[PDB]
């Protein structure tokens, strides 16, 4: 469910990297029900 941009669950981490110390706790346990296996894996592909 993607309503709008704030619709998106990237939005919590992508746009908000100076305020990502704290905020993040929902990304963290819903990464693992998203498969945190796709999560690892694919930050270990595509490296910044």
């Given at each position: 469910?993607?309503?709008?941009?704030?619709?998106?669950?990237?939005a919590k981490?992508?746009?908000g990297g100076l305020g990502k110390?704290?905020?993040?706790?929902v990304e963290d346990l819903?990464?693992?029900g998203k498969g945190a296996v796709h999560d690892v894996k694919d930050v270990l592909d595509?490296?910044?």
């Open positions: 469910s993607s309503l709008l941009e704030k619709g998106l669950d990237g981490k992508a746009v110390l704290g905020k993040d706790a819903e990464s693992v595509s490296v910044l």
